[PDB]
Scaffold this active site. Structure first.
Site, PDB file in Angstrom:
ATOM      1  N   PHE A  61     -31.981 -60.640  29.029  1.00  0.00           N
ATOM      2  CA  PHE A  61     -30.811 -61.362  29.576  1.00  0.00           C
ATOM      3  C   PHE A  61     -31.097 -62.028  30.907  1.00  0.00           C
ATOM      4  O   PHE A  61     -31.601 -61.309  31.777  1.00  0.00           O
ATOM      5  CB  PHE A  61     -29.668 -60.391  29.822  1.00  0.00           C
ATOM      6  CG  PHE A  61     -28.323 -61.015  30.072  1.00  0.00           C
ATOM      7  CD1 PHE A  61     -27.732 -61.832  29.122  1.00  0.00           C
ATOM      8  CD2 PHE A  61     -27.639 -60.763  31.247  1.00  0.00           C
ATOM      9  CE1 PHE A  61     -26.488 -62.393  29.351  1.00  0.00           C
ATOM     10  CE2 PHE A  61     -26.398 -61.332  31.478  1.00  0.00           C
ATOM     11  CZ  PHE A  61     -25.825 -62.143  30.530  1.00  0.00           C
ATOM     12  N   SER A 129     -35.688 -55.468  27.051  1.00  0.00           N
ATOM     13  CA  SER A 129     -34.219 -55.364  27.264  1.00  0.00           C
ATOM     14  C   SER A 129     -33.472 -55.772  25.999  1.00  0.00           C
ATOM     15  O   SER A 129     -33.706 -55.173  24.962  1.00  0.00           O
ATOM     16  CB  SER A 129     -33.766 -56.168  28.465  1.00  0.00           C
ATOM     17  OG  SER A 129     -32.607 -55.613  29.058  1.00  0.00           O
ATOM     18  N   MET A 130     -32.590 -56.753  26.117  1.00  0.00           N
ATOM     19  CA  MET A 130     -31.881 -57.335  24.959  1.00  0.00           C
ATOM     20  C   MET A 130     -32.924 -57.921  24.005  1.00  0.00           C
ATOM     21  O   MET A 130     -32.661 -57.958  22.815  1.00  0.00           O
ATOM     22  CB  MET A 130     -30.969 -58.459  25.457  1.00  0.00           C
ATOM     23  CG  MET A 130     -29.700 -57.993  26.164  1.00  0.00           C
ATOM     24  SD  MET A 130     -28.500 -59.321  26.487  1.00  0.00           S
ATOM     25  CE  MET A 130     -27.493 -58.555  27.752  1.00  0.00           C
ATOM     26  N   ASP A 175     -34.988 -45.664  33.987  1.00  0.00           N
ATOM     27  CA  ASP A 175     -34.131 -46.808  33.577  1.00  0.00           C
ATOM     28  C   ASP A 175     -32.637 -46.561  33.821  1.00  0.00           C
ATOM     29  O   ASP A 175     -32.061 -45.719  33.162  1.00  0.00           O
ATOM     30  CB  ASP A 175     -34.394 -47.187  32.119  1.00  0.00           C
ATOM     31  CG  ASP A 175     -34.224 -46.043  31.135  1.00  0.00           C
ATOM     32  OD1 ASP A 175     -34.077 -44.885  31.576  1.00  0.00           O
ATOM     33  OD2 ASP A 175     -34.251 -46.318  29.933  1.00  0.00           O
ATOM     34  N   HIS A 207     -36.454 -50.271  34.586  1.00  0.00           N
ATOM     35  CA  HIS A 207     -36.188 -51.224  33.478  1.00  0.00           C
ATOM     36  C   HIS A 207     -37.076 -52.472  33.582  1.00  0.00           C
ATOM     37  O   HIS A 207     -37.321 -53.085  32.560  1.00  0.00           O
ATOM     38  CB  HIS A 207     -34.702 -51.603  33.488  1.00  0.00           C
ATOM     39  CG  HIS A 207     -34.297 -52.528  32.401  1.00  0.00           C
ATOM     40  ND1 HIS A 207     -34.379 -52.177  31.078  1.00  0.00           N
ATOM     41  CD2 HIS A 207     -33.800 -53.776  32.441  1.00  0.00           C
ATOM     42  CE1 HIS A 207     -33.948 -53.173  30.341  1.00  0.00           C
ATOM     43  NE2 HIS A 207     -33.590 -54.164  31.154  1.00  0.00           N
TER      44      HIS A 207
HETATM   45  O1  J1K Z   1     -27.493 -55.816  29.295  1.00  0.00           O
HETATM   46  C1  J1K Z   1     -28.050 -55.946  30.386  1.00  0.00           C
HETATM   47  O2  J1K Z   1     -29.252 -56.199  30.534  1.00  0.00           O
HETATM   48  C2  J1K Z   1     -27.220 -55.776  31.606  1.00  0.00           C
HETATM   49  C3  J1K Z   1     -26.406 -54.666  31.746  1.00  0.00           C
HETATM   50  C4  J1K Z   1     -25.636 -54.505  32.881  1.00  0.00           C
HETATM   51  C5  J1K Z   1     -25.667 -55.451  33.898  1.00  0.00           C
HETATM   52  C6  J1K Z   1     -24.840 -55.273  35.139  1.00  0.00           C
HETATM   53  O3  J1K Z   1     -24.729 -54.169  35.671  1.00  0.00           O
HETATM   54  N1  J1K Z   1     -24.245 -56.358  35.633  1.00  0.00           N
HETATM   55  C7  J1K Z   1     -22.803 -56.533  35.566  1.00  0.00           C
HETATM   56  C8  J1K Z   1     -22.338 -57.675  36.431  1.00  0.00           C
HETATM   57  O4  J1K Z   1     -23.225 -58.775  36.353  1.00  0.00           O
HETATM   58  C9  J1K Z   1     -26.491 -56.557  33.754  1.00  0.00           C
HETATM   59  C10 J1K Z   1     -27.257 -56.719  32.617  1.00  0.00           C
END
Ligand code: J1K
Length: 257
Positions: A61, A129-130, A175, A207
């Site tokens: 992401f 990640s994703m 992570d 991560h």
């Molecule tokens: O799925 C992801 O990689 C991901 C998970 C959580 C966050 C985060 O904590 N941000 C929230 C506000 O931007 C960012 C990315």
């Protein structure tokens, strides 16, 4: 083995930033990519040994191709055609990332630079990640993929009973973004108990471990790709049984393969 490529492996050979095969690169533009945001293809110049299995790799992401760029050359140098892909958007979700990977491998069947250097029957998927979630979806939607490797995978989905492709799940211990308990581990134990699978936790890693050359990440990704894409029984030694770690806090597999 007709797909066996390269000299017999050493713990140094699989840990090398560059393996035996010298490698070249082609850049797929955002325009000339059907189903993905383009990418960079890595391939062995040496055709003397035969054709090479393919591997598609997605970033995570917000991330561009640079996140995972180190993996393409490092795996292709060992005997593989690798596409480092940039997503159609930086906000792409794991399921789309699963589509963009089948699109990228499909593109390899018609790319002029690597059509004759590839074996279109032996392919695999990988992601951070994703990007790792994507890799998991493309395997579930295609029972012909020869291997799959989620890296600090992130996803909303956890049931992976459909998955019928040899899968290596990779997690980082510290992570906080994509916890192993809620993700990586959750994905390994949802996979077919009777399949060829393995889970490996990396010690001390955040991560963002896959976003910088990590020798532990590369060697086992290269051993999985060799054992399942090339049916190489020479690399089973690095997976069965569990190995000495320092970097590995946890390992579990369905050995013997
Ligand atoms: O799925 C992801 O990689 C991901 C998970 C959580 C966050 C985060 O904590 N941000 C929230 C506000 O931007 C960012 C990315």
């Amino acid at each position: 083995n007709p797909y066996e490529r390269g000299p017999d492996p050493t713990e140094s050979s699989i840990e090398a930033v560059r393996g035996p095969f010298a490698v070249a690169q082609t850049t797929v533009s955002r325009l000339q990519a059907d189903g993905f945001g383009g990418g960079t293809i890595y391939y062995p110049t040496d055709t003397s040994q035969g054709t090479f299995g393919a591997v598609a790799i997605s970033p995570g992401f917000t991330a561009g191709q640079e996140s995972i760029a180190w993996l393409g050359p490092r795996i292709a140098s060992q005997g593989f055609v690798v596409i480092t892909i940039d997503t159609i958007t930086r906000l792409d979700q794991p399921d789309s990332r699963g589509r963009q990977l089948q699109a990228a491998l499909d593109h390899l069947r018609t790319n002029s630079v690597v059509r004759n250097r590839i074996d279109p029957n032996r392919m695999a998927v990988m992601g951070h990640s994703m990007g790792g979630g994507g890799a998991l979806s493309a395997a579930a939607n295609n029972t012909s993929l020869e291997a799959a490797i989620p890296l600090q995978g992130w996803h909303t989905r956890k049931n992976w009973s459909s998955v019928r492709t040899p899968t290596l799940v990779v997690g980082a211990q510290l992570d906080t973004i994509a916890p192993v308990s809620s993700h990586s581990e959750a994905f390994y134990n949802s996979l077919p108990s009777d399949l060829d699978k393995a889970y490996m936790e990396l010690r001390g890693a955040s991560h963002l471990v896959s976003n910088t050359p990590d020798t532990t990440t590369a060697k086992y990704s290269i051993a999985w790709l060799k054992r399942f894409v090339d049916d190489d029984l020479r690399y089973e030694q690095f997976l069965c049984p569990a190995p000495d770690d320092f970097a590995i806090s946890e390992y579990r597999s369905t050995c013997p393969f």
